Amino acid sequence: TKCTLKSFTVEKGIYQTSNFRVQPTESIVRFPNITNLCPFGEVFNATRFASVYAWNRKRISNCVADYSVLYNSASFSTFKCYGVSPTKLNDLCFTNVYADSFVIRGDEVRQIAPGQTGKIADYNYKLPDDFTGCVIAWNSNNLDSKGNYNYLYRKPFERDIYFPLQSYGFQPTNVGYQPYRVVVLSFELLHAPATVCGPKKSTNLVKNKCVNFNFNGLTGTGVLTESNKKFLPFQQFGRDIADTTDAVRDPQTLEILDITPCSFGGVSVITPGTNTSNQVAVLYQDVNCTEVNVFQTRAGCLIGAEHVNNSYECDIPIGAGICASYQTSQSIIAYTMSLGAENSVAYSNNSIAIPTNFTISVTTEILPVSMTKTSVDCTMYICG
Amino acid sequence: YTMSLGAENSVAYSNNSIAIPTNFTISVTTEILPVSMTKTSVDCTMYICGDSTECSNLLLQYGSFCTQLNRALTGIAVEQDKNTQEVFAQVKQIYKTPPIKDFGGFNFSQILPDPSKPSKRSFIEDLLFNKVTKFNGLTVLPPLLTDEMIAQYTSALLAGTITSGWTFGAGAALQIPFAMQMAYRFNGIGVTQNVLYENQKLIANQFNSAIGKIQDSLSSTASALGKLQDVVNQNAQALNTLVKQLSSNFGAISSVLNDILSRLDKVEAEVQIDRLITGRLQSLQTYVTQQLIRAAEIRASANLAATKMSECVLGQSKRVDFCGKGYHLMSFPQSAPHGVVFLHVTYVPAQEKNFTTAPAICHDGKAHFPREGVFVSNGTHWFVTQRNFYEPQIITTDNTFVSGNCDVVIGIVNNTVYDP
Amino acid sequence: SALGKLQDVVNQNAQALNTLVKQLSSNFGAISSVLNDILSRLDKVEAEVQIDRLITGRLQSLQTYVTQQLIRAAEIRASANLAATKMSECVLGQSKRVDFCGKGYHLMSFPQSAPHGVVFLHVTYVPAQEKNFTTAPAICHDGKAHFPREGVFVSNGTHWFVTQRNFYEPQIITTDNTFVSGNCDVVIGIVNNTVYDPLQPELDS
Amino acid sequence: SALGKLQDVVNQNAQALNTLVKQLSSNFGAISSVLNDILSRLDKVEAEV
Ligand SMILES: *[C@@H]1O[C@H](CO)[C@@H](O[C@@H]2O[C@H](CO)[C@@H](O)[C@H](O)[C@H]2NC(C)=O)[C@H](O)[C@H]1NC(C)=O
Ligand SMILES: *[C@@H]1O[C@H](CO)[C@@H](O[C@@H]2O[C@H](CO)[C@@H](O)[C@H](O)[C@H]2NC(C)=O)[C@H](O)[C@H]1NC(C)=O
Ligand SMILES: *[C@@H]1O[C@H](CO)[C@@H](O[C@@H]2O[C@H](CO)[C@@H](O)[C@H](O)[C@H]2NC(C)=O)[C@H](O)[C@H]1NC(C)=O
Ligand SMILES: *[C@@H]1O[C@H](CO)[C@@H](O[C@@H]2O[C@H](CO)[C@@H](O)[C@H](O)[C@H]2NC(C)=O)[C@H](O)[C@H]1NC(C)=O
Ligand SMILES: *[C@@H]1O[C@H](CO)[C@@H](O[C@@H]2O[C@H](CO)[C@@H](O)[C@H](O)[C@H]2NC(C)=O)[C@H](O)[C@H]1NC(C)=O
Ligand SMILES: *[C@@H]1O[C@H](CO)[C@@H](O[C@@H]2O[C@H](CO)[C@@H](O)[C@H](O)[C@H]2NC(C)=O)[C@H](O)[C@H]1NC(C)=O
Ligand SMILES: *[C@@H]1O[C@H](CO)[C@@H](O[C@@H]2O[C@H](CO)[C@@H](O)[C@H](O)[C@H]2NC(C)=O)[C@H](O)[C@H]1NC(C)=O
Ligand SMILES: *[C@@H]1O[C@H](CO)[C@@H](O)[C@H](O)[C@H]1NC(C)=O
Ligand SMILES: *[C@@H]1O[C@H](CO)[C@@H](O)[C@H](O)[C@H]1NC(C)=O
Numbered sequence A: 001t002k003c004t005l006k007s008f009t010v011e012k013g014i015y016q017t018s019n020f021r022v023q024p025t026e027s028i029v030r031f032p033n034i035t036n037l038c039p040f041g042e043v044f045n046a047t048r049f050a051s052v053y054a055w056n057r058k059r060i061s062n063c064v065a066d067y068s069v070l071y072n073s074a075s076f077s078t079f080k081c082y083g084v085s086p087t088k089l090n091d092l093c094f095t096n097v098y099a100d101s102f103v104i105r106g107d108e109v110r111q112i113a114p115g116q117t118g119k120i121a122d123y124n125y126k127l128p129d130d131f132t133g134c135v136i137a138w139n140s141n142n143l144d145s146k147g148n149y150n151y152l153y154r155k156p157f158e159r160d161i162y163f164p165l166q167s168y169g170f171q172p173t174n175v176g177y178q179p180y181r182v183v184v185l186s187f188e189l190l191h192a193p194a195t196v197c198g199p200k201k202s203t204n205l206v207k208n209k210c211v212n213f214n215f216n217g218l219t220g221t222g223v224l225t226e227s228n229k230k231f232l233p234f235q236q237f238g239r240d241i242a243d244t245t246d247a248v249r250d251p252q253t254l255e256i257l258d259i260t261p262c263s264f265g266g267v268s269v270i271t272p273g274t275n276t277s278n279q280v281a282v283l284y285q286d287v288n289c290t291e292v293n294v295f296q297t298r299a300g301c302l303i304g305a306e307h308v309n310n311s312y313e314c315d316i317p318i319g320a321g322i323c324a325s326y327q328t329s330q331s332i333i334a335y336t337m338s339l340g341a342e343n344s345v346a347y348s349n350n351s352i353a354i355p356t357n358f359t360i361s362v363t364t365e366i367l368p369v370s371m372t373k374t375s376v377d378c379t380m381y382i383c384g
Numbered sequence B: 001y002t003m004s005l006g007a008e009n010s011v012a013y014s015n016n017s018i019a020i021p022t023n024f025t026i027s028v029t030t031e032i033l034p035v036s037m038t039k040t041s042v043d044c045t046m047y048i049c050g051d052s053t054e055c056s057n058l059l060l061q062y063g064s065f066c067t068q069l070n071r072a073l074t075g076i077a078v079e080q081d082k083n084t085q086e087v088f089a090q091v092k093q094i095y096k097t098p099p100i101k102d103f104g105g106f107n108f109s110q111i112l113p114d115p116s117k118p119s120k121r122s123f124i125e126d127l128l129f130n131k132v133t134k135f136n137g138l139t140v141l142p143p144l145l146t147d148e149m150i151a152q153y154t155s156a157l158l159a160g161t162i163t164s165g166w167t168f169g170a171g172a173a174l175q176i177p178f179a180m181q182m183a184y185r186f187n188g189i190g191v192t193q194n195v196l197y198e199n200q201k202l203i204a205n206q207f208n209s210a211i212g213k214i215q216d217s218l219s220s221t222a223s224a225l226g227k228l229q230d231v232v233n234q235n236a237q238a239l240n241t242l243v244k245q246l247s248s249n250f251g252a253i254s255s256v257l258n259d260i261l262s263r264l265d266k267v268e269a270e271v272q273i274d275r276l277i278t279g280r281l282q283s284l285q286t287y288v289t290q291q292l293i294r295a296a297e298i299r300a301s302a303n304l305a306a307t308k309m310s311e312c313v314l315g316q317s318k319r320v321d322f323c324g325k326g327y328h329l330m331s332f333p334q335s336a337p338h339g340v341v342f343l344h345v346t347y348v349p350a351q352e353k354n355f356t357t358a359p360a361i362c363h364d365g366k367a368h369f370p371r372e373g374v375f376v377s378n379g380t381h382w383f384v385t386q387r388n389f390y391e392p393q394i395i396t397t398d399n400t401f402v403s404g405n406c407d408v409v410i411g412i413v414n415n416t417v418y419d420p
Numbered sequence C: 001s002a003l004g005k006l007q008d009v010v011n012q013n014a015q016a017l018n019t020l021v022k023q024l025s026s027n028f029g030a031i032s033s034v035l036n037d038i039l040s041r042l043d044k045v046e047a048e049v050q051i052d053r054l055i056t057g058r059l060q061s062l063q064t065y066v067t068q069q070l071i072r073a074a075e076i077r078a079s080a081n082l083a084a085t086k087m088s089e090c091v092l093g094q095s096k097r098v099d100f101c102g103k104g105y106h107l108m109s110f111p112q113s114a115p116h117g118v119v120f121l122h123v124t125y126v127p128a129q130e131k132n133f134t135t136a137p138a139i140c141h142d143g144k145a146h147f148p149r150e151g152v153f154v155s156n157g158t159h160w161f162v163t164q165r166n167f168y169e170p171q172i173i174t175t176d177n178t179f180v181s182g183n184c185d186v187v188i189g190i191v192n193n194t195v196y197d198p199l200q201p202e203l204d205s
Numbered sequence D: 001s002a003l004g005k006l007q008d009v010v011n012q013n014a015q016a017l018n019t020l021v022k023q024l025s026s027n028f029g030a031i032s033s034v035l036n037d038i039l040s041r042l043d044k045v046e047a048e049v
């Protein structure tokens, strides 16, 4: 409370200080149960790469991808990744991965990016502007040079198989005019079943307990529970209005789990003034007395306040007809607020009460009329 | 089509014609007022960052924006209890109604509590309660007064009003028979109190029937509560707009913060997360600004409802059209979800006749003027009568006062004035 | 604590200004909250990227302050319009409006000034020592129903009086205190008592 | 000068609309205040910034 108010004195009242949040008890990792190592050797160590006018696409699926074996290979002159960072790839997984394999001149690697331009990007190898993937390249002048005029150059991922055709004199003595191999990996993140996943090992599943989960790279925290949601066969995830995932299908056992965020609420602290007592009571807002001088109000579980069967004027307001006060031997007490003294007016069809005397009361009413006329020199405030 | 402004009417004016109403109708009119709105509170760190520690650390760089949003929503939430307290808690004691309902023929049973209920609302308060109908850190706090406490305040206001008139607002409740309370309420509109006691069954039947018509309206017609349902709909639309804005990218690679944190490493992720922090923080500042302006509109309505409680329920109002159309007699409060409903009872004059009229009467060369009321003629004889109800009295030195001779007054007429 | 409304208005404006000053210590994502660090550490092309984060955050901080001061100024104006209405109706007049000029029947109000506000000392009549009486709407005499011109019929248990509503002063019932309207049979709860004619003993003497 | 309250309400709304239109001439840190300069001078990746 003192830290919330940035003050060492706290005046009498109720203060929303802080947030109660049940913590993840353990971490849960769910990935498909498949163990084939992905055929990246048949991509990167192929005998000859294709010409860029007629590049080859290898589908990678139903396998485990150890991407650090690629990223750590000092032979790669670039490993630029776009919608993902190469360090994260082992934690994360995809429905498919597609590897595009071809040779280009070493000057031309700069054209192979989302939204880049130049004749190879314009004619024969175009990337999407919203591409998710990695572009990987290395000098192959030791292997693809001879020159080797078999290497020939001319929408996104369209194979465009005098006219716009040219070919390369790749020779070992060439520096820009040297051959480079390129692999472009495209990652299919879409909400189907994953089939190309990192080496990260699956745990067992846990239900009805708060956990730090990961399904197919979908990280989160929540209470996992069995659910009645009829996911159609093509659907792996279900979403909230806020886009946050609301339910999932387990990748090893195809059953549907609800995700519920772990129990949370505002922590209101009820205090007399610190210049009266250092005792306090705590209201866990909306929470029931289970996840947390204990009393379930309709405002939440109230702890450290003594429930009293009397009623008094509302001293500190808690909510839903409940108030608290500091009273005598002292404690904080919590009670239903009194609306006023009850009175049966002595009515009958022929009785009247007439006042035989008066009192001249003087009552004081206080009204705000003005406030401090501030003026801020916004250029001196902003720029000093 | 071009809209009609109303039916056209040539008022039958001439320099010596007056219309005086020979009969009345006791109108009961229903006024519905918003008083409070849903006490939302938003945990701005959980809205913006969703328990990401990575985002929560970036959100500290924005300083006290998050704590002043929580402060502004807390100020709005606290004034909803203040607004509700100022309207209903105008009564110092919880007055209760006698076991015998000897109110001179008037029948409040449809606006008084029923003990049969789980919450002791009246019949009309149950109609009014039936006709009005997340994990992202958004929460709703309960009101301080429960609807059962609001119903004890409207019951106390109503039981005080019935058993004691305005007197329970000015001091202690002084009991008075309800037929005699209404006789004072007739004098308060300038209708002479004998008009009530001579027409008491008729006036009671018109009141009982007018309360019956409130039940028939509120049972059939859900559009009556439109002001309270609008206040519910605006707060629901504002919260749903605030939740839907979490699906927006704001120019980041994803709207979902766990995509950014699972796909990107720290230096790349923090650039994307700052776009989500900027957009989600602008989304809260937009919500809290419109809730501050909406809370000021509800406070203006709660101050109006608190003024109608004091002047219409605890009093009788001379202010034209403040407590419903017609001359105000009295008002009964009924509670409704986030609001109050006043059943404003008013005298409406109802069956005119045209009469010849004069400002003064010449007798013995003296000009006589009415002490109260108007000179009128049926065509052959001259009478003095009260303004708001035709009751013709013979013209006498008791009903009228002299001032000077005849010659000064434009349109004086010659008739005898009887000296008793 | 009597002055709580005026001290609240002082506290809100001080809290708003202190919040506006404290926001100058915020980075808003720049390398420093202090603009002279940026300008001494970084050269122009790099510095202008950092300074635009501070301009954006400080300008948002000012727009937030001015927006809340506009809404707070509208709340103070509503209170000033109310105070101006209490000045006209309670001080310059006497108000029939129930509970407008304090609890009880309003007599008069005196303005006193206070810091950023006004204080009204609302003087009111409060009726204070009741008695219960039997009452009637009208009196039957000679078959005529008599009603009070002003006030109420009451009985001490044996005799009938007419008295004003807000203070017990029992007057003998006479044809000056009361007016006839029609015969007895129409009125629910009429009672039988004589009504004195003040002329009769003057002519009987 | 009698109608000062009504002319003030007209002047405030005109001043607010003229301020809203004049703000279209502001760069806000872009290379131009004019959106067709950006779209004719810069290609997609650079223009969208
Ligand atoms: C896909 O194929 C169509 C032909 O069916 C191509 O359309 C022609 O494009 C050239 C310019 O490149 C035009 O001169 C022709 O008039 C077009 N013909 C027709 C029938 O529209 C189309 O360009 C191809 N797509 C790409 C990206 O090359
Ligand atoms: C007051 O009015 C109510 C209706 O507005 C009367 O209630 C009805 O009373 C009869 C018996 O007399 C019952 O059969 C009905 O079911 C009642 N209706 C409801 C909705 O409760 C009531 O009788 C009237 N009071 C008096 C004393 O006449
Ligand atoms: C004054 O108006 C009322 C209606 O507001 C008249 O009362 C009705 O009279 C008819 C017969 O003419 C009865 O059948 C109805 O039951 C009465 N209604 C009520 C509510 O009692 C009344 O007769 C009129 N009186 C005069 C003198 O015009
Ligand atoms: C105007 O009012 C007077 C008094 O009410 C009427 O005069 C009485 O008329 C009745 C018949 O309707 C006679 O029996 C009475 O003897 C008359 N009394 C007097 C004192 O003359 C008069 O008729 C009314 N005139 C009109 C045009 O309605
Ligand atoms: C009211 O009655 C008086 C008489 O009692 C009328 O006065 C006469 O009016 C005529 C015309 O102006 C004069 O020629 C007479 O000399 C007046 N006589 C007296 C005794 O004054 C008077 O005109 C009548 N008023 C109206 C409005 O008709
Ligand atoms: C009601 O009031 C009347 C008049 O004030 C009281 O009658 C008088 O009572 C006194 C004694 O208290 C006698 O001396 C007078 O002679 C009485 N006057 C008359 C005209 O009878 C009466 O006593 C009061 N009754 C009660 C129950 O208080
Ligand atoms: C007021 O006094 C009259 C008599 O002056 C009472 O009228 C008598 O009432 C009884 C019982 O109903 C009848 O037997 C008589 O025939 C009535 N006499 C007359 C002349 O009408 C009247 O009841 C009294 N009123 C009250 C309210 O007590
Ligand atoms: C390519 O082959 C060499 C051995 O010749 C091996 O060290 C390397 O890991 C292989 N690369 C891939 C991607 O399989
Ligand atoms: C995958 O694992 C689950 C247990 O997690 C098992 O039920 C299922 O039969 C396994 N499928 C295969 C193809 O091994």
Ligand SMILES: *[C@@H]1O[C@H](CO)[C@@H](O)[C@H](O)[C@H]1NC(C)=O
Pocket (backbone or CB within 6 Å): A273, A275, A276
């Ligand atoms: C603070 O506490 C002291 C007793 O320790 C008391 O004398 C003093 O009046 C208190 N002041 C306030 C403002 O409550």
Ligand SMILES: *[C@@H]1O[C@H](CO)[C@@H](O)[C@H](O)[C@H]1NC(C)=O
Pocket (backbone or CB within 6 Å): A288, A289, A290, A296
């Ligand atoms: C609190 O939880 C228990 C079960 O643990 C349940 O029976 C009870 O109804 C709950 N009470 C409230 C007020 O939610």
Ligand SMILES: *[C@@H]1O[C@H](CO)[C@@H](O)[C@H](O)[C@H]1NC(C)=O
Pocket (backbone or CB within 6 Å): A307, A308, A309
């Ligand atoms: C309140 O009173 C009841 C009896 O009326 C008793 O059973 C109960 O234990 C009391 N509760 C507390 C908190 O003292």
Ligand SMILES: *[C@@H]1O[C@H](CO)[C@@H](O)[C@H](O)[C@H]1NC(C)=O
Pocket (backbone or CB within 6 Å): B012, B019, B352, B353, B354
């Ligand atoms: C009064 O007289 C005028 C004469 O034109 C007539 O139009 C009007 O209907 C009359 N009103 C009543 C209530 O008799």
Ligand SMILES: *[C@@H]1O[C@H](CO)[C@@H](O)[C@H](O)[C@H]1NC(C)=O
Pocket (backbone or CB within 6 Å): B015, B016, B358, B410, B411, B412
């Ligand atoms: C009304 O006007 C007529 C002329 O049209 C005039 O003779 C008469 O004296 C006027 N009466 C009043 C009451 O003004």
Ligand SMILES: *[C@@H]1O[C@H](CO)[C@@H](O)[C@H](O)[C@H]1NC(C)=O
Pocket (backbone or CB within 6 Å): A346, A353, C130, C131, C132
């Ligand atoms: C009036 O009489 C009733 C009789 O039950 C009593 O309850 C009430 O307190 C009395 N009031 C006064 C002011 O004497």
Ligand SMILES: *[C@@H]1O[C@H](CO)[C@@H](O)[C@H](O)[C@H]1NC(C)=O
Pocket (backbone or CB within 6 Å): A349, A350, B102, C136, C188, C189, C190
């Ligand atoms: C009051 O009620 C009684 C029956 O309880 C009745 O005899 C009497 O006439 C009524 N008096 C009035 C003033 O209504």
